[PDB]
Amino acid sequence: KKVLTLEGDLVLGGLFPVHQKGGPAEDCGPVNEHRGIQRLEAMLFALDRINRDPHLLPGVRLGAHILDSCSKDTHALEQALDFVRASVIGGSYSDVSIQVANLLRLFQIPQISYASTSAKLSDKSRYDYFARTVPPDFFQAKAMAEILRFFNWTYVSTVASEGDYGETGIEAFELEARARNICVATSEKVGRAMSRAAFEGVVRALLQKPSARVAVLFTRSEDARELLAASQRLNASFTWVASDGWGALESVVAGSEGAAEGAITIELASYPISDFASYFQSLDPWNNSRNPWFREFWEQRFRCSFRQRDCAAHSLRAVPFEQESKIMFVVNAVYAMAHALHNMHRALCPNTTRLCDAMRPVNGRRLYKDFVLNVKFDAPFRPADTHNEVRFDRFGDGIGRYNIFTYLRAGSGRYRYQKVGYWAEGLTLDTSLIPWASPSAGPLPASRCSEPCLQNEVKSVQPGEVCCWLCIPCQPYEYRLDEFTCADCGLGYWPNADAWAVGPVTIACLGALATLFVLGVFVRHNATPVVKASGRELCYILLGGVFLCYCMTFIFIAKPSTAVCTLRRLGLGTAFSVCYSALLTKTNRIAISPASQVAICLALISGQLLIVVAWLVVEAPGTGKETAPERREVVTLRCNHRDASMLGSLAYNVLLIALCTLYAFKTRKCPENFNEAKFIGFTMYTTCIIWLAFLPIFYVTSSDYRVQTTTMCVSVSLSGSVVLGCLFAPKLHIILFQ
Amino acid sequence: NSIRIDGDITLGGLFPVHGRGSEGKPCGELKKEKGIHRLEAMLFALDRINNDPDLLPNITLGARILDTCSRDTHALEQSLTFVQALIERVVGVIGASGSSVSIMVANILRLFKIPQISYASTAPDLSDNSRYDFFSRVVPSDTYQAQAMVDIVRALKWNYVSTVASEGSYGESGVEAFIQKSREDGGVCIAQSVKIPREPKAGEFDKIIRRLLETSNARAVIIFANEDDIRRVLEAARRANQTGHFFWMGSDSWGSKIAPVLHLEEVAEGAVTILPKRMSVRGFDRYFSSRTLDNNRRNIWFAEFWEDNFHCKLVKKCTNRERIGQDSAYEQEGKVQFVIDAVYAMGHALHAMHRDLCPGRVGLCPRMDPVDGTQLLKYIRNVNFSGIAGNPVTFNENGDAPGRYDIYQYQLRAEYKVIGSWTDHLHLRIQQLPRSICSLPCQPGERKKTVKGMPCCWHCEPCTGYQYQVDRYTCKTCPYDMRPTENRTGCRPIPIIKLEWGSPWAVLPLFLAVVGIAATLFVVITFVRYNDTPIVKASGRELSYVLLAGIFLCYATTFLMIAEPDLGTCSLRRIFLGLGMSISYAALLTKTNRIYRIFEQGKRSVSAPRFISPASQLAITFSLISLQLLGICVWFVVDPSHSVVDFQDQRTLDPRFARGVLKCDISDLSLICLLGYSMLLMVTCTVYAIKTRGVPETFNEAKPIGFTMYTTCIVWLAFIPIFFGTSQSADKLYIQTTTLTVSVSLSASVSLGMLYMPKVYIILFHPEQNVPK
Ligand SMILES: N[C@@H](CCP(=O)(O)O)C(=O)O
């Protein structure tokens, strides 16, 4: 009926729960001392201070139409509409703040809540012009997730009440959690309207998944009570944290002081206005009659009656005064609106010290987007030691301050809340104040499983425990694929997608030089008996075997193709098909004239090796990188005829003369130039042995392509040279020394 | 201000009596064709409801009417008087009009639990029941009419179109619904979409047309805008001389309304627009036509109705007696059925409520004064009845009437004729007018490339090179067998070139080789006739035999080098490319060596060189021949004879001139290696000729042999530079072949010129000289 009408140049309407619900009996119940009247009086104290403020709106006296919500939606609109008719700060409970916004926006009238938090009033597609002096409990997600990060704590069970605010906080928490790589072990909502066993069931469900032995709660305290009672009854072993829906609330921790130790709560930090507490404590509305609902307040606050003027004898100040911290939002809402108006006037009435006609109409968005959210200062009457940067984000979220505190063991007294730290936009905490984490207390109970193993080891794929997957190595040829395996690369060792070769080069070159230095001795002496008595064409085919060993050595190291590996294998015949075989006729003539005997031998040499040539030039397998799933960094192989028994045909070609003819060793007894006759008998035998000594490399070195290439290259050059000298010794003795 | 009609219960009503307007009057001209036409009809229906013994029995239904103007901020402010009566009491409203008018009001009345019904705005937005929990239309939304427009464009087989809409939820979401449904169908691309401001500038419309005309593959335009917006565009069309350039179309925003088309009748010929399925109301048409304009009580604008419909005061004051039906002042109102329907529908819902809420009463029941509109809403959705003119009244729970509407054609001679109808499917029959379709179809070989990703559009790109078509969008390379059809429908044989033995160049060796054989035989016959005469025996009769056979083959080989390709040709060619060169040298080596050995042997011993006897010497010649035969056999083994067709050599830029070649596949490796061995015998012969420089004239053939080699080795060696130098020519098929034929035939000629021809002359013509020299 009454609206505390205040006079002014600009009138701000508003809406407070002066009365409780009268349910179906009356529309209005008794007055709300703490929710209604104290908040209104604080509003008025602030409004009078604003009108008397030398810097804030000096040209605009603020009048008012403050409505009685009667704690009902019906009244909120029957009365909110009066401010439209008349041409807003209000909203305590939320059904009211929402519906009022639905009407005010239609007339381009902005609304700031002073107490209503609800996250639904974030939806600007339905509620565009509004601001919330208090951020909804959704925000606590941010702090909650940060507390878990502080603790290195991460993998965790979580709970809401049956609250839609509970859903809101849980969804919000999931978002903030995922952003920080924090995993839900498991979670649920919790009815008020369920048996104690159901509350125990919730606690058991936590305790039934002990991958971490810790949890977090969104709630309202009636639930937090029975949850904490169930925790205590079950002797539940965990640590846990709650939303300020159970912040502090000594009342919850009374049945279960012991279980209550393992926990922290947020509260929105309290910064009571002592100036207003003073004004209210000394307030005496009997005389200061402006607020019409005080007569009821007096009668019930002090037990008296004004019917007989009995309350008149009991000054209101007689009853001790206390206030909710909430008073600061009542005040911030009026100052924030006044400031928005102030800035609006600086923008629309820039050169005038009194309200301008520009502000007679309702301005919509001009207030809302440009001045209402763009508020930034320290709140008046706030304790001097701190700051709240009153501001709103683009959705009207009033930016705020929050105490983070734990319930301490008191072996010498009652258990007490203790500030550990605070939240603001981020978290600060002193660990020494935590009973389960301060270093002397030991570590937090399991709150972890496994690391971001996403590398040379990658996660397992353990069913269920995804956020707890084991760490497992890949295999030494692969590259990163998923969080849990690796793709096979190209060929090479773990790709992430000839040291002694100088040996054979040196010996081959030296072999060739020595070979020809000696040939020139034999050739210079072609007209000398040392050559006339020799199978000179064969002497030369034999000597040439070392020169060929040299040539073959370089072929042996040619980039692999069938063009060269066939020759390579044949070359292991060739070297002695000539280096041993000339002994055949030397031996024969000492042991169809000699000229023909030589031609016959030459034909035999070529014939037998050519049989083998025919056998190898027809082999299909060639060169490549077959390599091995082992080693992997093996590059460019010679033809894949490893340990091929066809090689025995080369050994044969040599033994065909070298072992199979040694009856002729008797030649050493022949009375013709004994220096040579003795050596032919000696060297045929010795040579067979020397060559056989080199031979085993055919299988011995097959395990390593660089080693066997290097080895055969040296052995071929060396074997040939060692052997030639076996008989050249007496030939050169005579030529060079006689 | 407003009309206040007494009754026992009251129903609100809302209509654009004014349009929008200026800042001082947001309410300019009277829109009589949405407003007062329909208002009287509502009031008519209101009286009929009150006069209906079976509807709201014993209850007078009163009313409250307001003028929307059109700028909907006027609606609400007003709604506030209406609202104070709601919270003299009003039960509900007929609210309707355009978008901004309906959507603002749906958000105020629902907050007091007051139901609202629309005879008008079809916009999608109002089907959000979380925002319009108290609301229904009485018509199908733009979700249907947009689909219908898409179906009609697809029935026109058009693909490419321009749209225009003015501001406000109706236009802006409506055309956006058409755009999205068109895109979902995929059979259409939007050339463009043009917004009209609520307050456009004059001349913008000419600019709009010029923009509409840029997309010249469109000949049609779609409209959701209001009446006036359309005249500004079609008036511009007259100025722009676009009359009959275009098809034009409308959602419900315009149609049977005559003020759109009048004075611009040729503009938008055949234009197709939609109206919600509508019938006239004869009882009203009659009443309206016959009503005296000063006998209409409780209608504050009816005096204005006279003034605007009769173009004079009710100065030119004219007699009030004239019926509106007697002048141009009168016609049938296009939507009157809906406004009458909507008010009855609420009356029927109220009736259903009384039979529920107040089942034992007629006349007033106190329970309905503070009636919970939720129950009123239940009957708004639950009541189903045959409406006025027999049109069934039903709408779903989001308040859409189910889709049903009629398709009209603007016919000149001029009226909107029915083309057909739609209920999620078209039933149209056809007037002949332009087409709106994007890219035009493409020729054979014109492989389409899509214009961007735009489904209805392409570039008709002609296929190229050796490619032939495989899809409307795709062409692919024809294999080596063929060069494309010019139409690129497929592919056609590469013409294959053969080496012609009669070509201008092939004819030279073709006949020289024959002459060579004839000359060789002249010599052979003489030698045979004189086989037992010393003049023949002295040079080695058998050695002569082999040399002459060699010469014969040299020429036979060259003749055959230009022989028609076959496998028989390849095998014989390869064996003889070798033999036709090597036999001659093998024979020369044997004989030349015999001379050299005798010459040097005589310096040390009288004994003839051992094995110089023909018994061994002939074998030497044949052994050298066999060594080559074995090498040739290897060449056949590693890479065997084949008659093949070369496509790759002349795959030219213009495939009509692409030519393949039918050739014997003799690799240049063997073409040379088959000659290389023979060359080495030639080299050896040259060396023997050098070794023999000290040989005296007493050796009958020692000198002319040296001479044959002096020339022969050049004839041959000249082959290589030419063979390779000409290897890059398009004509190499005959150039390299004749290069080879010429040196082989010439070498044969050289041998005859020094060793046989002058000897034959003496053997045959001078018997007195037939001595062993
Ligand atoms: N303004 C209305 C015209 C039809 P009415 O006469 O109002 O029923 C409309 O846009 O649909």
Side-chain angles (χ1 to χ4, degrees), chain A residues 1-152 154-479 481-738, chain B residues 1-33 35-37 39-70 73-334 336-773:
Chain A
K1 291 180 180 179
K2 305 297 184 182
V3 298
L4 302 172
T5 305
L6 304 176
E7 71 281 354
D9 296 292
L10 186 149
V11 178
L12 295 175
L15 180 65
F16 290 69
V18 171
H19 295 93
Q20 295 174 41
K21 292 182 175 177
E26 289 287 349
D27 288 347
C28 301
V31 298
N32 287 303
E33 295 81 5
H34 295 290
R35 290 188 292 270
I37 292 169
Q38 289 174 356
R39 292 181 188 156
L40 285 170
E41 195 67 21
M43 174 197 69
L44 290 170
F45 288 153
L47 291 171
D48 287 342
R49 290 288 299 173
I50 292 166
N51 283 332
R52 295 169 66 187
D53 186 310
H55 302 290
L56 175 62
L57 299 175
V60 181
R61 185 175 180 85
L62 298 175
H65 297 292
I66 309 301
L67 305 173
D68 184 358
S69 76
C70 188
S71 298
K72 295 184 81 170
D73 52 349
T74 297
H75 273 276
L77 301 183
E78 287 175 0
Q79 294 181 52
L81 190 60
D82 197 62
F83 189 72
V84 176
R85 186 184 67 81
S87 179
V88 175
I89 302 171
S92 50
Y93 177 93
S94 66
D95 292 344
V96 171
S97 70
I98 296 298
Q99 295 306 320
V100 171
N102 280 334
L103 289 174
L104 293 176
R105 68 181 293 267
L106 298 175
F107 306 103
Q108 298 291 294
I109 300 168
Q111 183 183 348
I112 185 164
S113 71
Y114 64 87
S116 174
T117 76
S118 185
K120 294 185 186 77
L121 190 60
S122 59
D123 183 356
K124 292 197 295 186
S125 73
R126 290 177 172 85
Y127 311 105
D128 51 3
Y129 300 161
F130 73 94
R132 290 159 288 185
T133 301
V134 185
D137 62 357
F138 94 87
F139 84 79
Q140 300 175 27
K142 306 167 188 185
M144 289 152 163
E146 286 182 13
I147 284 164
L148 300 170
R149 175 61 65 84
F150 166 82
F151 273 124
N152 305 11
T154 50
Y155 178 88
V156 63
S157 303
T158 73
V159 180
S161 54
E162 58 162 292
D164 57 340
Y165 61 83
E167 300 156 21
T168 300
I170 279 291
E171 290 173 354
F173 176 73
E174 293 158 13
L175 291 156
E176 293 307 318
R178 287 194 296 271
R180 292 165 179 78
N181 299 316
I182 298 167
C183 181
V184 172
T186 184
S187 65
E188 64 204 303
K189 288 185 77 201
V190 174
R192 300 161 293 175
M194 65 183 193
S195 67
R196 72 184 184 275
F199 284 87
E200 291 175 353
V202 171
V203 173
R204 290 185 184 97
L206 177 63
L207 297 173
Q208 289 168 352
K209 198 175 188 176
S211 295
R213 292 79 154 177
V214 293
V216 189
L217 175 65
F218 266 102
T219 194
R220 294 296 182 271
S221 65
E222 69 278 21
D223 304 322
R225 173 176 308 299
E226 186 53 38
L227 290 168
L228 180 63
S231 168
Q232 189 69 65
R233 286 193 296 272
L234 296 172
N235 298 316
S237 183
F238 70 123
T239 55
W240 60 97
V241 170
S243 64
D244 68 7
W246 174 57
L249 280 156
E250 302 70 19
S251 61
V252 161
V253 300
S256 299
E257 187 178 59
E261 290 175 359
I264 279 159
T265 69
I266 174 160
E267 183 65 13
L268 202 164
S270 171
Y271 307 100
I273 299 170
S274 66
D275 291 350
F276 286 15
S278 179
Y279 296 163
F280 201 104
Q281 182 68 82
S282 294
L283 191 70
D284 192 34
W286 168 239
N287 292 325
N288 294 321
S289 67
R290 178 177 63 186
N291 179 340
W293 301 282
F294 269 110
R295 294 289 181 268
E296 181 174 324
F297 183 89
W298 274 67
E299 291 178 343
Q300 300 303 307
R301 182 64 185 164
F302 183 97
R303 187 73 174 181
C304 61
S305 175
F306 280 112
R307 184 171 67 194
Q308 291 81 231
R309 300 171 66 85
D310 295 305
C311 288
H314 305 292
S315 300
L316 188 61
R317 68 175 66 92
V319 181
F321 179 81
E322 65 182 297
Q323 61 189 18
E324 295 182 358
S325 67
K326 196 79 180 189
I327 193 169
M328 71 193 163
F329 309 119
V330 173
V331 174
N332 287 339
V334 300
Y335 277 92
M337 184 61 75
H339 188 70
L341 293 173
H342 185 79
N343 290 334
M344 173 64 96
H345 284 80
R346 290 194 285 171
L348 271 56
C349 188
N351 60 2
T352 299
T353 58
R354 297 290 184 273
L355 186 143
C356 294
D357 289 344
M359 290 299 290
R360 302 288 184 190
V362 176
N363 282 276
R365 67 189 182 276
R366 291 174 176 166
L367 286 166
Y368 178 70
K369 74 180 171 63
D370 294 298
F371 304 109
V372 172
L373 301 174
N374 296 319
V375 176
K376 296 220 161 189
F377 314 87
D378 306 339
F381 319 114
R382 183 176 177 84
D385 54 289
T386 188
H387 298 270
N388 54 353
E389 296 290 352
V390 177
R391 291 169 291 166
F392 301 88
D393 70 5
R394 68 186 181 276
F395 301 101
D397 196 45
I399 309 182
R401 295 291 177 254
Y402 296 128
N403 291 329
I404 307 300
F405 51 94
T406 189
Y407 193 60
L408 299 177
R409 180 178 294 167
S412 61
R414 295 273 65 81
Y415 290 21
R416 73 180 194 85
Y417 297 116
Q418 173 64 55
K419 185 176 181 180
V420 177
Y422 73 97
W423 206 86
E425 302 71 29
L427 184 69
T428 299
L429 295 172
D430 183 343
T431 307
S432 70
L433 300 175
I434 301 172
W436 57 88
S438 177
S440 66
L444 183 72
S447 64
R448 299 188 70 92
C449 282
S450 62
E451 296 309 305
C453 171
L454 301 171
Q455 51 88 32
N456 312 279
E457 303 194 66
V458 285
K459 267 176 156 182
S460 79
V461 298
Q462 163 62 48
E465 257 198 313
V466 174
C467 297
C468 298
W469 277 349
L470 318 178
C471 181
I472 296 188
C474 286
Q475 282 298 284
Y477 44 90
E478 307 174 309
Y479 76 100
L481 178 69
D482 317 325
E483 70 269 47
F484 70 83
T485 194
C486 298
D488 185 17
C489 303
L491 179 65
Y493 179 90
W494 184 245
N496 193 20
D498 61 351
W500 296 347
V502 298
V505 172
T506 299
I507 194 171
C509 293
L510 292 172
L513 290 170
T515 296
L516 300 178
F517 289 156
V518 173
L519 178 60
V521 174
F522 284 105
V523 172
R524 179 65 182 83
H525 287 280
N526 282 338
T528 300
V530 299
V531 175
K532 289 177 173 174
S534 297
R536 67 189 182 274
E537 298 84 340
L538 291 163
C539 293
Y540 297 156
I541 203 170
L542 171 142
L543 182 148
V546 175
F547 187 75
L548 290 170
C549 291
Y550 160 79
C551 294
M552 291 188 292
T553 295
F554 285 92
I555 292 168
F556 292 168
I557 62 169
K559 184 176 181 180
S561 69
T562 58
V564 296
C565 73
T566 302
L567 294 173
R568 175 193 60 80
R569 178 61 68 191
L570 290 167
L572 301 174
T574 302
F576 284 85
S577 73
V578 305
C579 291
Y580 190 95
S581 68
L583 290 168
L584 186 152
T585 63
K586 291 180 187 185
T587 301
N588 289 337
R589 70 176 298 279
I590 299 300
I592 62 169
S593 72
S596 293
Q597 292 168 23
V598 170
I600 292 164
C601 184
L602 291 168
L604 292 171
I605 292 166
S606 293
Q608 186 64 58
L609 186 58
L610 289 169
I611 291 168
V612 174
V613 171
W615 295 348
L616 301 180
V617 299
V618 300
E619 290 287 350
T623 64
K625 296 184 181 178
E626 311 77 11
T627 60
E630 297 181 355
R631 297 176 186 179
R632 298 291 189 133
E633 292 291 339
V634 181
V635 179
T636 303
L637 303 177
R638 190 70 60 193
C639 296
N640 293 307
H641 295 280
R642 176 171 170 172
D643 305 329
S645 66
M646 289 300 293
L647 68 88
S649 69
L650 299 170
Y652 167 74
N653 291 349
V654 176
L655 291 170
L656 179 59
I657 299 171
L659 183 62
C660 298
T661 64
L662 299 176
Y663 315 114
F665 75 89
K666 70 182 183 180
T667 196
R668 68 185 71 194
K669 297 179 181 179
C670 179
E672 181 176 354
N673 194 14
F674 271 116
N675 288 339
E676 296 180 13
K678 288 179 178 179
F679 276 78
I680 293 167
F682 298 160
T683 63
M684 287 188 287
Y685 176 78
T686 299
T687 298
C688 184
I689 293 167
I690 292 165
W691 172 82
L692 286 167
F694 284 101
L695 178 62
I697 63 171
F698 75 85
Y699 69 93
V700 171
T701 61
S702 67
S703 70
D704 182 329
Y705 84 106
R706 292 295 190 185
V707 171
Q708 70 181 352
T709 300
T710 301
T711 300
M712 74 190 290
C713 289
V714 173
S715 292
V716 172
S717 181
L718 181 59
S719 181
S721 293
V722 171
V723 171
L724 293 178
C726 291
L727 183 58
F728 289 173
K731 296 299 293 185
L732 295 174
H733 299 291
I734 294 167
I735 294 167
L736 301 177
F737 297 84
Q738 298 184 326
Chain B
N1 297 8
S2 61
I3 301 168
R4 299 176 297 281
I5 297 168
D6 288 342
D8 294 302
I9 65 172
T10 301
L11 175 49
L14 185 56
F15 307 84
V17 170
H18 296 79
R20 67 187 182 291
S22 71
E23 301 91 331
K25 183 89 190 306
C27 306
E29 297 77 13
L30 206 169
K31 297 290 166 176
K32 69 186 191 297
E33 320 84 344
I36 60 173
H37 286 188
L39 174 59
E40 188 177 19
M42 186 283 293
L43 294 172
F44 171 75
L46 180 62
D47 286 342
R48 290 175 67 200
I49 291 166
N50 286 336
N51 294 327
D52 182 342
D54 294 324
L55 176 62
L56 302 176
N58 298 327
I59 300 168
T60 299
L61 180 63
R64 296 290 182 275
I65 306 94
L66 249 181
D67 174 13
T68 63
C69 303
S70 318
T73 59
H74 174 98
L76 266 287
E77 200 69 21
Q78 293 177 335
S79 195
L80 290 171
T81 299
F82 181 74
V83 172
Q84 185 64 58
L86 292 169
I87 185 168
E88 295 180 357
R89 187 184 296 279
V90 178
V91 76
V93 75
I94 300 307
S97 186
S99 63
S100 52
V101 178
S102 54
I103 213 157
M104 296 181 84
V105 178
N107 279 328
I108 198 167
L109 293 177
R110 71 188 185 87
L111 298 173
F112 304 115
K113 296 181 175 176
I114 305 300
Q116 172 177 348
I117 298 182
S118 172
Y119 65 65
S121 196
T122 51
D125 302 286
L126 300 95
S127 71
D128 186 0
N129 296 331
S130 72
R131 294 175 187 269
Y132 309 108
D133 44 322
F134 278 74
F135 190 84
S136 84
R137 304 164 290 296
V138 312
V139 296
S141 59
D142 294 276
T143 189
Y144 292 86
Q145 293 193 23
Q147 182 62 49
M149 184 61 66
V150 173
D151 290 345
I152 290 164
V153 173
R154 295 277 61 243
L156 293 161
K157 310 295 149 192
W158 289 0
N159 289 337
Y160 184 92
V161 299
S162 298
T163 64
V164 185
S166 58
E167 280 187 299
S169 64
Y170 174 45
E172 299 185 63
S173 72
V175 75
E176 188 59 39
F178 171 79
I179 291 166
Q180 294 305 322
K181 297 305 289 181
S182 295
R183 190 198 50 53
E184 290 176 0
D185 183 82
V188 182
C189 320
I190 290 71
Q192 61 184 285
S193 178
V194 179
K195 176 171 61 178
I196 283 158
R198 302 191 202 150
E199 305 309 320
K201 302 297 186 184
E204 184 63 35
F205 295 93
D206 298 352
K207 293 177 186 176
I208 290 168
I209 291 169
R210 287 192 294 274
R211 289 194 294 270
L212 291 171
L213 296 173
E214 290 178 348
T215 53
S216 67
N217 325 281
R219 298 295 300 273
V221 201
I222 293 169
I223 309 296
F224 288 81
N226 75 48
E227 175 187 349
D228 290 290
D229 295 338
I230 298 150
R231 282 192 287 271
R232 289 191 299 275
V233 172
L234 295 192
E235 290 172 349
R238 291 188 295 197
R239 289 193 296 274
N241 198 31
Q242 299 301 306
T243 304
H245 183 77
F246 279 113
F247 263 117
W248 289 86
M249 294 189 81
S251 65
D252 170 277
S253 295
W254 86 277
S256 62
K257 301 294 133 188
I258 189 64
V261 288
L262 212 75
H263 326 293
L264 289 87
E265 293 85 347
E266 295 80 5
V267 178
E269 176 178 358
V272 173
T273 59
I274 278 162
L275 302 177
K277 185 157 187 73
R278 181 177 65 83
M279 295 179 281
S280 66
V281 179
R282 290 191 296 275
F284 179 69
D285 293 346
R286 178 194 62 78
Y287 176 77
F288 182 77
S289 181
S290 293
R291 180 80 273 173
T292 305
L293 277 72
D294 57 349
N295 294 138
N296 186 329
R297 299 282 74 82
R298 315 305 295 165
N299 187 334
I300 64 174
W301 308 286
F302 214 67
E304 293 176 353
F305 172 59
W306 180 280
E307 184 173 3
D308 293 303
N309 289 71
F310 294 79
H311 307 284
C312 60
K313 301 296 187 183
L314 181 63
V315 176
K316 300 183 183 181
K317 185 178 175 76
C318 293
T319 304
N320 58 344
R321 292 195 299 274
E322 183 180 334
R323 303 295 94 184
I324 197 167
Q326 292 178 274
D327 204 352
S328 69
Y330 171 82
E331 168 56 336
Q332 186 173 355
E333 170 42 42
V336 76
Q337 181 180 24
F338 292 124
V339 316
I340 292 169
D341 163 350
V343 74
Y344 271 98
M346 190 166 293
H348 288 294
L350 291 168
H351 183 71
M353 283 286 292
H354 286 295
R355 293 176 292 164
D356 181 10
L357 180 62
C358 302
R361 298 180 71 86
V362 299
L364 290 170
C365 180
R367 293 176 184 171
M368 185 173 281
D369 186 70
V371 66
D372 185 321
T374 302
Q375 192 181 6
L376 293 174
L377 288 177
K378 289 178 183 178
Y379 286 106
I380 286 167
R381 286 162 168 69
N382 290 337
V383 175
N384 286 268
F385 63 99
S386 296
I388 196 165
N391 188 354
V393 177
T394 191
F395 44 74
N396 192 31
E397 67 276 18
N398 296 9
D400 289 345
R404 177 169 54 91
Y405 63 89
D406 285 331
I407 297 84
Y408 298 62
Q409 185 170 48
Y410 194 54
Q411 179 70 56
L412 304 179
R413 184 176 179 183
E415 307 91 71
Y416 314 99
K417 303 296 189 183
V418 175
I419 296 170
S421 68
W422 184 97
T423 57
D424 295 314
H425 185 76
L426 292 171
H427 300 279
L428 305 182
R429 298 291 183 275
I430 303 299
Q431 296 184 300
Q432 171 165 334
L433 287 171
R435 304 184 177 82
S436 310
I437 61 171
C438 207
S439 298
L440 304 184
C442 313
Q443 295 300 337
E446 288 185 337
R447 63 160 304 183
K448 285 187 180 184
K449 313 302 174 64
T450 311
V451 158
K452 201 189 182 182
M454 310 326 294
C456 74
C457 305
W458 56 81
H459 310 287
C460 292
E461 300 196 357
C463 179
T464 60
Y466 294 85
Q467 302 216 323
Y468 76 95
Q469 190 173 9
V470 300
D471 184 1
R472 182 69 279 173
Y473 280 77
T474 309
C475 199
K476 290 187 182 178
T477 319
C478 179
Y480 280 90
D481 56 356
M482 292 201 285
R483 292 173 296 180
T485 56
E486 71 281 5
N487 297 344
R488 296 178 188 278
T489 48
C491 207
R492 299 182 184 136
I494 302 288
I496 306 302
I497 294 169
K498 295 171 69 171
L499 177 63
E500 184 180 10
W501 51 88
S503 75
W505 305 273
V507 293
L508 175 62
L510 183 64
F511 293 107
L512 292 173
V514 173
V515 171
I517 294 296
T520 300
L521 292 172
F522 177 82
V523 171
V524 171
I525 293 169
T526 298
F527 272 78
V528 171
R529 288 174 178 170
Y530 292 92
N531 279 337
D532 290 306
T533 300
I535 195 164
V536 173
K537 292 190 289 187
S539 68
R541 184 169 70 189
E542 296 79 8
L543 293 173
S544 180
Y545 169 80
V546 175
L547 286 166
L548 290 169
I551 291 166
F552 181 93
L553 291 171
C554 295
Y555 292 117
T557 300
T558 59
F559 183 79
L560 294 172
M561 290 178 200
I562 59 170
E564 189 178 12
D566 200 333
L567 296 176
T569 299
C570 287
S571 293
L572 292 171
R573 180 169 174 173
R574 290 181 187 194
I575 198 67
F576 287 105
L577 292 177
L579 292 171
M581 186 180 166
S582 67
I583 292 168
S584 294
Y585 296 118
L588 288 169
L589 291 171
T590 299
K591 182 171 173 68
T592 303
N593 190 53
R594 290 183 82 257
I595 292 168
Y596 183 66
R597 290 183 69 201
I598 293 165
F599 170 72
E600 292 297 314
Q601 180 65 5
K603 294 179 183 178
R604 67 181 182 171
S605 178
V606 300
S607 295
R610 190 177 179 183
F611 309 113
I612 203 162
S613 171
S616 295
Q617 293 291 310
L618 293 170
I620 292 168
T621 299
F622 289 111
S623 63
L624 292 171
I625 292 167
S626 293
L627 292 173
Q628 189 176 42
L629 292 173
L630 293 170
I632 295 167
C633 292
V634 171
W635 285 112
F636 280 110
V637 172
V638 301
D639 188 359
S641 296
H642 295 81
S643 175
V644 301
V645 178
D646 184 331
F647 296 106
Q648 294 71 24
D649 191 68
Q650 300 295 308
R651 285 277 268 206
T652 188
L653 293 173
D654 180 338
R656 301 177 295 166
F657 302 102
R659 296 290 183 272
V661 180
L662 177 64
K663 67 186 192 186
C664 183
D665 194 12
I666 304 170
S667 173
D668 54 299
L669 176 60
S670 66
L671 289 170
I672 302 304
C673 293
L674 293 170
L675 300 172
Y677 178 85
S678 298
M679 179 193 74
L680 294 172
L681 295 173
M682 182 190 81
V683 171
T684 302
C685 291
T686 300
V687 171
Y688 293 173
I690 293 167
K691 288 181 177 181
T692 52
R693 288 175 292 169
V695 175
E697 295 79 8
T698 64
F699 289 86
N700 291 348
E701 295 81 42
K703 299 297 182 181
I705 292 168
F707 286 98
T708 56
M709 291 310 303
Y710 294 159
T711 300
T712 298
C713 65
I714 303 305
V715 169
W716 179 253
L717 291 170
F719 173 76
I720 294 293
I722 296 166
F723 176 82
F724 283 99
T726 61
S727 69
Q728 302 301 301
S729 175
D731 286 342
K732 67 185 172 287
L733 180 64
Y734 67 81
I735 295 167
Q736 290 180 317
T737 301
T738 61
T739 297
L740 185 56
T741 56
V742 171
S743 290
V744 172
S745 292
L746 289 172
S747 293
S749 181
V750 172
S751 182
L752 291 172
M754 293 303 294
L755 300 174
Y756 294 100
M757 289 177 179
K759 301 307 293 185
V760 170
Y761 174 77
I762 297 300
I763 293 165
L764 185 60
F765 296 97
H766 292 274
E768 72 278 0
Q769 297 181 47
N770 290 343
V771 302
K773 182 174 180 177

